């Protein structure tokens, strides 16, 4: 099954389509909306349903120029690493053998290994956090999570912060593996995100079940001649 197979009906629901209408309207009314329309669903593009190994929820897309490009916690090449991702990198550096601080915040290569980097809200107005949170995106991502729970087996979910924890509170904790911790934002990272060890634990679960671990060191697309 592909994402479109399992979400085709969901994407004909008014809460979904009216959301996209709203976004398209605001973009033409002098409001900058992030990410660009072609990037809104990049988490799905880069991590097909059958390839999901680890789900990491974000909440809102980043709301500044150059930041959001459709993957939770990631930013485009050449853009500063946002504080939440810096704290993820610090936990990685303290736990994954050989990890060192990347010089970029671009996480496509996680997605390409099976890490679904899913914000629960998929658009935002420039400079205004949570400004699209009361559209239909949470309903849409509730359905995404429900479908992974039902259609996949042995997925590791990393639920960071209360919002994410609530979002994933009904995941099957026997067929899947649910790990919780405070959010890596500077407001909460020292309240238990540091020390959560989720990246190693996720890889050990995956290993235990015959899946390859995630290489958490993210890499930029290369140059050609």
Swiss-Prot record:
EC category: hydrolase
Enzyme nomenclature, EC number: 3.2.2.27
UniProt GO molecular function: uracil DNA N-glycosylase activity
Gene Ontology CC terms: cytoplasm
Gene3D superfamilies: Uracil-DNA glycosylase-like domain (3.40.470.10)
Active site as annotated: 60 (proton acceptor)
Xref: SMART domains: UDG (SM00986), UreE_C (SM00987)
Keywords assigned: Cytoplasm, DNA damage, DNA repair, Hydrolase
CDD domains, A to Z: UDG-F1-like
Cell compartments where the protein resides: Cytoplasm
Pfam families documented for this protein: UDG
Gene Ontology biological process terms, A to Z: base-excision repair, AP site formation via deaminated base removal
Swiss-Prot/TrEMBL catalytic activity: Hydrolyzes single-stranded DNA or mismatched double-stranded DNA and polynucleotides, releasing free uracil
InterPro entries: UDG_fam1 (IPR002043), Ura-DNA_Glyclase_AS (IPR018085), Uracil-DNA_glycosylase-like (IPR005122), Uracil-DNA_glycosylase-like_sf (IPR036895)
Annotated family: Belongs to the uracil-DNA glycosylase (UDG) superfamily. UNG family.
Function: Excises uracil residues from the DNA which can arise as a result of misincorporation of dUMP residues by DNA polymerase or due to deamination of cytosine.
The name this protein goes by in its record: Uracil-DNA glycosylase
């Amino acid at each position: 099954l592909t994402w479109h197979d399992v979400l085709a009906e969901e994407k004909q629901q008014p809460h979904f389509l009216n959301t996209l209408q709203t976004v398209a309207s605001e973009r033409q009314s002098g409001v900058t909306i992030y990410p660009p329309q072609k990037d809104v669903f990049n988490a799905f593009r880069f991590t097909e349903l059958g390839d999901v190994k680890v789900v990491i929820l974000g909440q809102d897309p980043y709301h500044g120029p150059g930041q959001a490009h459709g993957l939770a916690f990631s930013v485009r090449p050449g853009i500063a690493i946002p504080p939440s991702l810096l704290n993820m990198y610090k936990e990685l550096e303290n736990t994954i053998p050989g990890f060192t601080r990347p010089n970029h915040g671009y996480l496509e290569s996680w997605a390409r290994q099976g890490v679904l980097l899913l914000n629960t809200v998929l658009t935002v107005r420039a400079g205004q956090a949570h400004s699209h949170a009361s559209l239909g995106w949470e309903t849409f991502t509730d359905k995404v999570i429900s479908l992974i729970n039902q259609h996949r087996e042995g997925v590791v979910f990393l639920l960071w912060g209360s919002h994410a924890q609530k979002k994933g509170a009904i995941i099957d904790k026997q067929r899947h593996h649910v790990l919780k911790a405070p959010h890596p934002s500077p407001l909460s990272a020292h309240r238990g995100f540091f020390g959560c060890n989720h990246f190693v634990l996720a890889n050990q679960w995956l290993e235990q079940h015959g899946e390859t671990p995630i290489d958490w060191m993210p890499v930029l697309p290369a140059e050609s001649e």
